[PDB]
């Protein structure tokens, strides 16, 4: 119902575009049964409606090969109507078309080169003789003949805009050649089809800007005015300016564009004068649309604005949009990233009466965006844009355009072996062989990372679930945690429970918490934001909680997103435990975190993972379910786990077969994973020392150790030490046992 | 302008947005602006001699006007265009719907009652949205690209009570556009237990608003404050969500430290503005989640810190005191660390009522478990009373965690069954006893003794 | 043929002295493009409306000398975060730069290059696709690279036969 | 100031209390301080102008 305006309803005049086998530029072919349906006689001229406000006149023809629902129509007429193959175009019989008295023709500059004879003498004169072909302004057609056929642009028609060609009509080609770049600009025009995702937002926008102008009788009869103000807000790169461009290109109303800072002037009264001139020009021109890009630049809150010029500009805008003299058929659209920065009096019904949320698209929306951006790109058959839509999580549409461009640049980089930068021009073979494969899209996906997250981008050392030894239960819990709500939300809806989204790792130092975070960062299919503990805190008042708010907002935008606090105890600590710390800035940060993780706002797919050595100081309101639901204890590895750790560290390293990792694990009791990794690194150092010593003695004699041996491990173990004492183990065990005894039951079983 | 008004007397001068041209002279940093303000003062003075000119002005920041321009002889008479009452909103709706082709089932009295903080721009917006809904219902019958519209559709096209209900669903006051938060749908049935707390909340809301004459007659001022304190996960923010969804009062949900700002004087301005727009949209509920952030005991951190938190709490207390009894702004605070709240908050007249949200007892735990699993397929053989008996000290958050753990285990089993099916090709109807037992073996008690 | 417009915004970041300005100048000279340099603080103007006026005039000139390379030294000073800064002028500068770089009217054929020691201080909207496509990290050179730098600065000056630039190339 | 100095071909530019003009970048929050430091840097990068312009600090 909300998107009811977008439907087409299979109107009989709408017809699928299809290629025409033998038709020329001024004629098209439609099936005879369809012409029977449309009461259309053969040889009649018809007026075809196309996308982006383009009308063309072609002579209808009867074809047995053409189908009823398809219309056969060549390259020229489609490029006139700006329609791709398979699009729907409206057809109606042209009423009382009058034979053209004078028509002006201008050819395209890239085609006129290399031609000797006069273009009108060679091509225009025979084509326009006995043609009886209707033409219209804005039309580009190609006429066969000569060494090179020349594409011609119908710049002027008298009578305007459509007219039939008559022998007594004069055909002259005098004038400047029309630039091919300008023709490309005319063809590459953004329209309502170029906006992907945001179908409901685009439906509301169309209901405001299109419906009143198309059918003013609706609002006249229902006896009330349409809304006349749109505030498009959203994160950067979601397509607000793009929707403005589409509205401009695809509405009959006069479109006046305002960019925020352009209004600004030094002279007192000059900026207000620029605004008044803009609105006055819109008023003079009948129905009109004014688009104010970057509204928050020129419309800040009058209470919070110190400068007199800015306050006067806001007051001028307020008075213009809704004053004692009302607007007459003027729509004001505005786009802003920060809607709450706008002055509150602008956000009532008089001025900006509906605010449209151009939000981050879902998987289907970003698939539609990918199709939009790759329509021009020539793609292989292996390319699967649906997969790319799945793998991209927080992308907003500008990031998908970046992904497509990066894929194409990688495809071109694959072809620089054959192609020469030094050569001026490229042979046809490589250029034709040039295409984008799925590997290029995979490379672009690897590099791609949401623009909203560019601030919070950290390298991770490429850990995998293999590199972690032991912790099988924890690995499975984390994989399920991050993968279930993103892959199978269906199951959660069917069972009707929201997922649990909090994890806290607490355990002795060196035992594998930050390693598990690296594994999640590399492996899980979700965005990752890594936060060191105290990087949020700031000396400025109220800015620490502002950083907390903005980081949690970044997580919500890029959902599904994993938010990792490497040292939770620094940022999260029991409230009231400190004497100084500013005015309790630490406690205010705790309260802000509590409110962000479980507050009155609705929940997103943001999984908060915290790692701490000291889980006893943490505020108990952090550890309650709904915030850090599960407390996962990462203990010192046991003997099987130690075998696994030693195998994982030495997996990439050449090691001797005599080395008994089982014995190493049996002896190393109480060792953490970090200690065992240190043992391996020490063995490597001793081996490298022996290797360098052998190299030096060879250099001496002229003027060995392919793999780590057993003696190296013997020495390294002789150096090795235990890192976690028994006291630390006892403290961690105390916390774990308190948590276990909190249940009060060893095991739970229902009565029979 | 003033000479032209004098020439054609009697005359009226209207100065739209007076605060644009007449700011305070001491504040203004421009010479031309000060010349404007002084010229305005001079012409106001000369007006009294002028026989038949009356000067009228408008502004929505009256305090920004220069204090000299509100004296005797200059804008000496002031008119306050306040927020309309229920009868006022009914008149506004009757004015705005007079041209519209209303149906028969549409009643404007219910619409007037449901719109609480609306001022008249909002009501015009409401009628416009109802019209767009009425048009949308016909977009199936006639399409946009069509040249014309069947006259039968135009005849049938009218505005019904369902359109007004849709517009009421979407409509929100223009004042509260900043402070709206998307709140999960929580109904009083979704909360288990706290029945006495629910009744006390409903009464403490509706009594001072619907019946203020009796509060006057008995001579007792109504309470404008509630403080929720209790262990974490026990139902404070849940009751706030329920009040926001259900109760017919505007709701402003604010985190604690959202008001605070680094710049000097900004934090107190934020507090004043938020209380102000609670006043504009009254009857309103103002909710301070984690109140122990902005209202912290003064003086403990006096030596260390910038000292702006003291001014923030002073501004909050000043707003709480200056708020009138007749104005219906309920202020609710939630805190799970009630001690570190300033006592001055707890003094009479501000956040008087203290509602303790305890750990649920056995009956309340049964109610909580039933509430969590109301929308969920649950096996019959799962005995919720036994679960409530076994979870003696669990907070409601712990019980929700148990149910979510059982859900995860069932989802894991169903995923494994599907994987088996796709493996053999080349299950789980509901949550059972064994899932709940595997979940309960993880269940831990969030709140210590 | 492949159907994609080339990336037209480049941000060079690295500590001072890594040669970002001279890299931009070298790229401008070696290609057929006029080098038009903008420095951050010098654009920053005092009155309202002269700052982004200077930005408009600069972009207009760089379009007149098409093709051209616009180098905006110290982008961190000119364009901080609009949320972070309190001054209106900085916010209007960032908005004008965004509009000039990508808007309902976009630049056609200019490449914009900006240098900044710290990229995180840049307002995020500038770091979007359409505006600053790619960020290139000009960092401290490795051994071979500083060998090349030493050779380049030493080409003009006469060198004795004992001179071995590999010593300093490893040492520094 | 640099323009007037560079107009004179032989020049000794004397700055008194440069530290107040240009304190450390990370020391002070003020953004106008970052701009003043960067403007001084860009002026001093090309003060020579292949000319006798010299600059002295106190
Ligand atoms: N929804 C979308 N569908 C298709 N392309 C999109 C969409 N959103 C963004 N793009 C692509 O991103 C480019 C730039 O985005 P755009 O300028 O519209 O962003 P924006 O969020 O409106 O930003 P700003 O308001 O700062 O101009 C567009 O030219 C288009 O290629
Ligand atoms: N189970 C394991 N498998 C593989 N490597 C491990 C394992 N446990 C620890 N390590 C090693 O420990 C080192 C880093 O330890 P890690 O970062 O996981 O510790 P942590 O628990 O975060 O400690 P901290 O308390 O100091 O933050 C790496 O060298 C890693 O190889
Ligand atoms: N009485 C209850 N009935 C139903 N669900 C409840 C109840 N109490 C708690 N819950 C559940 O537990 C959570 C309630 O947490 P809530 O936000 O109410 O806690 P809080 O008291 O505000 O705590 P905190 O001080 O930690 O912010 C929700 O997930 C809700 O489903
Ligand atoms: N290859 C190089 N890399 C870095 N710096 C170089 C190189 N070659 C020369 N330089 C020196 O760097 C000096 C200044 O670098 P500059 O242009 O200020 O970079 P930035 O502005 O990034 O600090 C130049 O005077 C030049 O002599
Ligand atoms: Mg924009
Ligand atoms: Mg760690
Ligand atoms: Mg809460």
UniProtKB/Swiss-Prot annotation, chain B:
Primary residence: cytoplasm
Subcellular location per the Swiss-Prot or TrEMBL entry: Cytoplasm, Cytosol; Endoplasmic reticulum; Nucleus; Cytoplasm, Stress granule
Modified residues (Phosphothreonine): 148
Binding of ATP 2, residues: 233-238
Residues bearing the modification Phosphoserine: 174, 414
EC number of the protein: 3.6.4.6
The keyword Endoplasmic reticulum belongs to this UniProt entry's keyword annotation: yes
Any single Gene Ontology cellular-component annotation: lipid droplet
Biological role stated in the UniProt entry: Necessary for the fragmentation of Golgi stacks during mitosis and for their reassembly after mitosis. Involved in the formation of the transitional endoplasmic reticulum (tER). The transfer of membranes from the endoplasmic reticulum to the Golgi apparatus occurs via 50-70 nm transition vesicles which derive from part-rough, part-smooth transitional elements of the endoplasmic reticulum (tER). Vesicle budding from the tER is an ATP-dependent process.
Family of the protein in this entry: Belongs to the AAA ATPase family.
UniProt protein name: Transitional endoplasmic reticulum ATPase
Section of the entire sequence shown: 289 to 749 of 806
Curated annotation (Swiss-Prot), chain C:
Record's subcellular location: Cytoplasm, Cytosol; Endoplasmic reticulum; Nucleus; Cytoplasm, Stress granule
Effect of residue 87 to A: Does not affect methylation by VCPKMT
Residues bearing the modification N6,N6,N6-trimethyllysine: 84
Annotated consequence of substituting residue 85 to A: Does not affect methylation by VCPKMT
Post-translational modification: Phosphorylated by tyrosine kinases in response to T-cell antigen receptor activation. Phosphorylated in mitotic cells. ISGylated.
Listed result of changing residue 81 to A: Does not affect methylation by VCPKMT
Coiled-coil parts of chain: none
Domain of life: Eukaryota
Domain notes from UniProt: The PIM (PUB-interaction motif) motif mediates interaction with the PUB domain of RNF31.
Recorded disease: Inclusion body myopathy with early-onset Paget disease with or without frontotemporal dementia 1: An autosomal dominant disease characterized by disabling muscle weakness clinically resembling to limb girdle muscular dystrophy, osteolytic bone lesions consistent with Paget disease, and premature frontotemporal dementia. Clinical features show incomplete penetrance. Frontotemporal dementia and/or amyotrophic lateral sclerosis 6: A neurodegenerative disorder characterized by frontotemporal dementia and/or amyotrophic lateral sclerosis in affected individuals. There is high intrafamilial variation. Frontotemporal dementia (FTD) is characterized by frontal and temporal lobe atrophy associated with neuronal loss, gliosis, and dementia. Patients exhibit progressive changes in social, behavioral, and/or language function.
Annotated family: Belongs to the AAA ATPase family.
Name the record gives this protein: Transitional endoplasmic reticulum ATPase
Record organism: Homo sapiens
Gene name tied to this protein: VCP
Full protein stretch here: 232 to 403 of 806
From Swiss-Prot, chain D:
Modifications the protein undergoes after translation, according to the UniProt entry: Phosphorylated by tyrosine kinases in response to T-cell antigen receptor activation. Phosphorylated in mitotic cells.
Intracellular or extracellular location(s): Cytoplasm, Cytosol; Endoplasmic reticulum; Nucleus; Cytoplasm, Stress granule
Source superkingdom: Eukaryota
Sites bearing N6,N6,N6-trimethyllysine, chain numbering: 27
Effect of residue 30 to A: Does not affect methylation by VCPKMT
Similarity annotation: Belongs to the AAA ATPase family.
UniProt disease link: Inclusion body myopathy with early-onset Paget disease with or without frontotemporal dementia 1: An autosomal dominant disease characterized by disabling muscle weakness clinically resembling to limb girdle muscular dystrophy, osteolytic bone lesions consistent with Paget disease, and premature frontotemporal dementia. Clinical features show incomplete penetrance. Frontotemporal dementia and/or amyotrophic lateral sclerosis 6: A neurodegenerative disorder characterized by frontotemporal dementia and/or amyotrophic lateral sclerosis in affected individuals. There is high intrafamilial variation. Frontotemporal dementia (FTD) is characterized by frontal and temporal lobe atrophy associated with neuronal loss, gliosis, and dementia. Patients exhibit progressive changes in social, behavioral, and/or language function.
Role description: Necessary for the fragmentation of Golgi stacks during mitosis and for their reassembly after mitosis. Involved in the formation of the transitional endoplasmic reticulum (tER). The transfer of membranes from the endoplasmic reticulum to the Golgi apparatus occurs via 50-70 nm transition vesicles which derive from part-rough, part-smooth transitional elements of the endoplasmic reticulum (tER). Vesicle budding from the tER is an ATP-dependent process.
Domain comment as written in the entry: The PIM (PUB-interaction motif) motif mediates interaction with the PUB domain of RNF31.
């Amino acid at each position: 119902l909300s998107t009811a305006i977008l439907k087409q309803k299979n109107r009989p005049n709408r017809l699928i575009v299809d290629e025409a086998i033998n038709e020329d530029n001024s004629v098209v072919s439609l099936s005879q049964p369809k012409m029977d349906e449309l009461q259309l006689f053969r040889g009649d001229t018809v007026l075809l409606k196309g996308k982006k406000r383009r009308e063309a006149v072609c002579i209808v023809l009867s074809d047995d090969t053409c189908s009823d629902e398809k219309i056969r129509m060549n390259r020229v007429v489609r490029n006139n109507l700006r329609v791709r193959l398979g699009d729907v175009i409206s057809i109606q019989p042209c009423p009382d078309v009058k034979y053209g008295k004078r028509i002006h023709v201008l050819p395209i500059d890239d085609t006129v080169e290399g031609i000797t004879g006069n273009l009108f003498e060679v091509y225009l004169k025979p084509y326009f003789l006995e043609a009886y072909r209707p033409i219209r302004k804005g039309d580009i057609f190609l006429v066969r003949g000569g060494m090179r056929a020349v594409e011609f642009k119908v710049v002027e028609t008298d009578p305007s805009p459509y007219c039939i060609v008559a022998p007594d009509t004069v055909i002259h080609c005098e004038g400047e050649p029309i630039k091919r770049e300008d023709e490309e600009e005319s063809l590459n025009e953004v329209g309502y089809d170029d906006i992907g995702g945001c179908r409901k937002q685009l439906a509301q926008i169309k209901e405001m800007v299109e419906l009143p102008l198309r059918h003013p009788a609706l609002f006249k009869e229902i006896g009330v005015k349409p809304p006349r103000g749109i505030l498009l807000y959203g994160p950067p790169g979601t397509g607000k300016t793009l929707i403005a461009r589409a509205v401009a290109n695809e509405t009959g109303a006069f479109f006046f564009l305002i960019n925020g800072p352009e209004i600004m002037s030094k002279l007192a009264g000059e900026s207000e004068s620029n605004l008044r001139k803009a609105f006055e020009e819109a008023e003079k021109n009948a129905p009109a649309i004014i688009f104010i890009d970057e509204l928050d630049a020129i419309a800040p809150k009058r209470e919070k604005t110190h400068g007199e010029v800015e306050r006067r500009i806001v007051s001028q805008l307020l008075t213009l949009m809704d004053g004692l003299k009302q607007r007459a058929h003027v729509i004001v659209m505005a786009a802003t990233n920060r809607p709450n920065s706008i002055d509150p009096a602008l956000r009532r019904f008089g001025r900006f009466d509906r605010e449209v949320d151009i939000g981050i698209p879902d998987a289907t929306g970003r698939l539609e965006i990918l199709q939009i951006h790759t329509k021009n790109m020539k793609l292989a058959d292996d390319v699967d844009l649906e997969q790319v839509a799945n793998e991209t999580h927080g992308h907003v549409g500008a990031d998908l355009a970046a992904l497509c461009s990066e894929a194409a640049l990688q495809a071109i980089r694959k072809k620089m072996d054959l192609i020469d930068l030094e050569d001026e021009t490229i042979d046809a073979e490589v250029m034709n062989s040039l295409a984008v494969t799925m590997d290029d899209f995979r490379w672009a996906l690897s590099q791609s990372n949401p623009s909203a997250l560019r601030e919070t981008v950290v390298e991770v050392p490429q850990v995998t679930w293999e590199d972690i030894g032991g912790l099988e239960d924890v690995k499975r819990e984390l994989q399920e945690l991050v993968q279930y709500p993103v892959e199978h939300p269906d199951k959660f809806l069917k069972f009707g429970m929201t997922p649990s989204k909090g994890v806290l790792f607490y355990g002795p130092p060196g035992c594998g918490k930050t390693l598990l975070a690296k594994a999640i960062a590399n492996e899980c299919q979700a965005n990752f934001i890594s936060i060191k503990g105290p990087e949020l805190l700031t000396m400025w008042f109220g800015e620490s909680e502002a950083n907390v708010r903005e980081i949690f907002d970044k997580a919500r935008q890029a959902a599904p997103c994993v938010l990792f606090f490497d040292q939770l105890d620094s940022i999260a600590k029991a409230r009231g435990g400190n004497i100084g710390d500013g005015g309790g800035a630490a406690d205010r940060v705790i309260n802000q975190i509590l409110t962000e993780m479980d507050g009155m706002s609705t929940k997103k797919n943001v999984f908060i993972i915290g790692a701490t050595n000291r889980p006893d100081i943490i505020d108990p309101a952090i550890l309650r379910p709904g915030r850090l639901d599960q407390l996962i204890y990462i203990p010192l590895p046991d003997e099987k786990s130690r075998v696994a750790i030693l195998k994982a560290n030495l997996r990439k390293s050449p090691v001797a077969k005599d080395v008994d990792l089982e014995f190493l694990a049996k002896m190393t009791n109480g060792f953490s994973g970090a200690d065992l990794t240190e043992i391996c690194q020490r063995a490597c150092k001793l081996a490298i020392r022996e290797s360098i010593e052998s190299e030096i003695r060879r250099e001496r004699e002229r003027q060995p150790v392919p793999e780590i041996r057993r003696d190296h491990f013997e020495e390294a173990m002789r150096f090795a030490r235990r890192s976690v004492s028994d006291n630390d183990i006892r403290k961690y065990e105390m916390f774990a046992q308190t948590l276990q005894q909190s249940r009060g039951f060893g095991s739970f079983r229902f009565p029979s």
